[PDB]
Design a protein around this motif. Structure first.
Motif, PDB file in Angstrom:
ATOM      1  N   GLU A   1      -9.934 -12.003  10.878  1.00 48.05           N
ATOM      2  CA  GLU A   1      -9.845 -11.926   9.316  1.00 48.05           C
ATOM      3  C   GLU A   1      -9.697 -10.734   8.901  1.00 48.05           C
ATOM      4  O   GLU A   1      -9.991  -9.666   9.504  1.00 48.05           O
ATOM      5  N   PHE A   2      -8.991 -10.622   7.824  1.00 44.68           N
ATOM      6  CA  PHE A   2      -8.562  -9.565   7.250  1.00 44.68           C
ATOM      7  C   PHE A   2      -9.405  -8.233   6.982  1.00 44.68           C
ATOM      8  O   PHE A   2      -8.860  -7.290   6.926  1.00 44.68           O
ATOM      9  N   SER A   3     -10.689  -8.521   6.661  1.00 41.10           N
ATOM     10  CA  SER A   3     -11.573  -7.622   6.730  1.00 41.10           C
ATOM     11  C   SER A   3     -12.007  -6.922   8.052  1.00 41.10           C
ATOM     12  O   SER A   3     -11.644  -5.602   8.084  1.00 41.10           O
ATOM     13  N   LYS A   4     -12.000  -7.473   9.090  1.00 36.97           N
ATOM     14  CA  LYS A   4     -12.264  -7.144  10.658  1.00 36.97           C
ATOM     15  C   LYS A   4     -10.811  -6.437  10.917  1.00 36.97           C
ATOM     16  O   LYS A   4     -10.817  -5.884  11.844  1.00 36.97           O
ATOM     17  N   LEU A   5      -9.922  -7.083  10.462  1.00 38.17           N
ATOM     18  CA  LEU A   5      -8.308  -6.616  10.926  1.00 38.17           C
ATOM     19  C   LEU A   5      -8.256  -5.231  10.681  1.00 38.17           C
ATOM     20  O   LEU A   5      -8.730  -4.638   9.670  1.00 38.17           O
ATOM     21  N   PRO A   6      -7.333  -4.573  11.450  1.00 38.00           N
ATOM     22  CA  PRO A   6      -7.234  -3.067  11.249  1.00 38.00           C
ATOM     23  C   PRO A   6      -6.726  -2.892   9.965  1.00 38.00           C
ATOM     24  O   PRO A   6      -5.957  -3.591   9.200  1.00 38.00           O
ATOM     25  N   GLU A   7      -7.392  -1.920   9.258  1.00 32.41           N
ATOM     26  CA  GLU A   7      -6.935  -1.443   7.743  1.00 32.41           C
ATOM     27  C   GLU A   7      -5.438  -0.833   7.737  1.00 32.41           C
ATOM     28  O   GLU A   7      -4.869  -1.414   6.603  1.00 32.41           O
ATOM     29  N   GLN A   8      -5.265  -0.184   8.774  1.00 29.90           N
ATOM     30  CA  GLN A   8      -3.704   0.328   8.584  1.00 29.90           C
ATOM     31  C   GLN A   8      -2.749  -0.852   8.859  1.00 29.90           C
ATOM     32  O   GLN A   8      -1.710  -0.913   8.169  1.00 29.90           O
ATOM     33  N   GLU A   9      -3.224  -1.781   9.605  1.00 30.47           N
ATOM     34  CA  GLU A   9      -2.339  -3.144   9.883  1.00 30.47           C
ATOM     35  C   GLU A   9      -2.042  -3.792   8.621  1.00 30.47           C
ATOM     36  O   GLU A   9      -1.034  -4.129   8.401  1.00 30.47           O
TER      37      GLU A   9
ATOM     38  N   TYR B   1      -0.036  -1.623   5.871  1.00 32.28           N
ATOM     39  CA  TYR B   1       1.572  -1.597   6.030  1.00 32.28           C
ATOM     40  C   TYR B   1       2.035  -3.017   5.955  1.00 32.28           C
ATOM     41  O   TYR B   1       3.180  -3.073   5.484  1.00 32.28           O
ATOM     42  N   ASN B   2       1.143  -4.258   5.917  1.00 32.24           N
ATOM     43  CA  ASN B   2       1.429  -5.442   5.811  1.00 32.24           C
ATOM     44  C   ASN B   2       1.798  -5.560   4.121  1.00 32.24           C
ATOM     45  O   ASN B   2       2.652  -6.049   3.657  1.00 32.24           O
ATOM     46  N   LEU B   3       0.922  -5.277   3.415  1.00 31.87           N
ATOM     47  CA  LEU B   3       1.011  -5.320   1.980  1.00 31.87           C
ATOM     48  C   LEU B   3       2.016  -4.534   1.496  1.00 31.87           C
ATOM     49  O   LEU B   3       2.600  -4.614   0.584  1.00 31.87           O
ATOM     50  N   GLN B   4       2.142  -3.249   2.297  1.00 33.12           N
ATOM     51  CA  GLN B   4       3.295  -2.049   1.901  1.00 33.12           C
ATOM     52  C   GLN B   4       4.478  -3.073   2.137  1.00 33.12           C
ATOM     53  O   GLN B   4       5.686  -2.828   1.424  1.00 33.12           O
ATOM     54  N   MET B   5       4.920  -3.653   3.197  1.00 34.37           N
ATOM     55  CA  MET B   5       6.177  -4.133   3.534  1.00 34.37           C
ATOM     56  C   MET B   5       6.240  -5.287   2.440  1.00 34.37           C
ATOM     57  O   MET B   5       7.591  -5.178   1.641  1.00 34.37           O
ATOM     58  N   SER B   6       5.349  -6.014   1.915  1.00 35.32           N
ATOM     59  CA  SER B   6       5.582  -7.176   0.839  1.00 35.32           C
ATOM     60  C   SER B   6       5.867  -6.320  -0.332  1.00 35.32           C
ATOM     61  O   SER B   6       6.777  -6.728  -1.103  1.00 35.32           O
ATOM     62  N   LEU B   7       5.073  -5.340  -0.825  1.00 31.89           N
ATOM     63  CA  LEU B   7       5.012  -4.801  -2.056  1.00 31.89           C
ATOM     64  C   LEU B   7       6.472  -4.102  -2.127  1.00 31.89           C
ATOM     65  O   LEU B   7       7.157  -4.250  -3.155  1.00 31.89           O
ATOM     66  N   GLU B   8       6.824  -3.074  -1.375  1.00 28.57           N
ATOM     67  CA  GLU B   8       8.086  -2.368  -1.460  1.00 28.57           C
ATOM     68  C   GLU B   8       9.380  -3.430  -1.060  1.00 28.57           C
ATOM     69  O   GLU B   8      10.539  -3.160  -1.544  1.00 28.57           O
ATOM     70  N   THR B   9       9.023  -4.466  -0.279  1.00 30.76           N
ATOM     71  CA  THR B   9      10.150  -5.561  -0.314  1.00 30.76           C
ATOM     72  C   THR B   9      10.412  -6.039  -1.681  1.00 30.76           C
ATOM     73  O   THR B   9      11.422  -6.125  -2.250  1.00 30.76           O
TER      74      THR B   9
END
Length: 96
Positions: free
Chosen positions: A3-11, A14-22
């Motif tokens: 779950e994205f809460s317990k999922l690594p914050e930096q992970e 950079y996921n939403l960073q890939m999507s956003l800057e994409t």
């Protein structure tokens, strides 16, 4: 696979960073974005997946029915431009 809460914050960052800057690089290359039908999600029917394929986290995936999406040659070229830009940004980050 957590779950994205317990999922690594930096992970997830950079996921939403890939999507956003994409999408930002899309609109920077010259994309024209327009709203057509917000109810298209309800119009299209989600494919049926088994319970085990459904994620144990509880969040509900919404895989849209990729049959009706058609890629024009211009869209293929813009896909190629987006991929080239992603390669360029990753290479520049590694070089710095």
């Amino acid at each position: 696979l957590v779950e994205f809460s317990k999922l690594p914050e930096q992970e997830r960052n950079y996921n939403l960073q890939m999507s956003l800057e994409t999408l930002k690089t899309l609109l920077a290359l010259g994309c024209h974005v327009g709203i057509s039908d917000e109810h298209a999600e309800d119009k299209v029917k989600k494919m049926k997946l088994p319970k085990n394929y459904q994620l144990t986290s509880g969040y509900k995936p919404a895989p849209m029915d990729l049959s009706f999406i058609k890629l024009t040659p211009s869209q293929e070229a813009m896909v190629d431009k987006l991929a080239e830009n992603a390669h360029n940004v990753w290479a520049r980050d590694r070089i710095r």
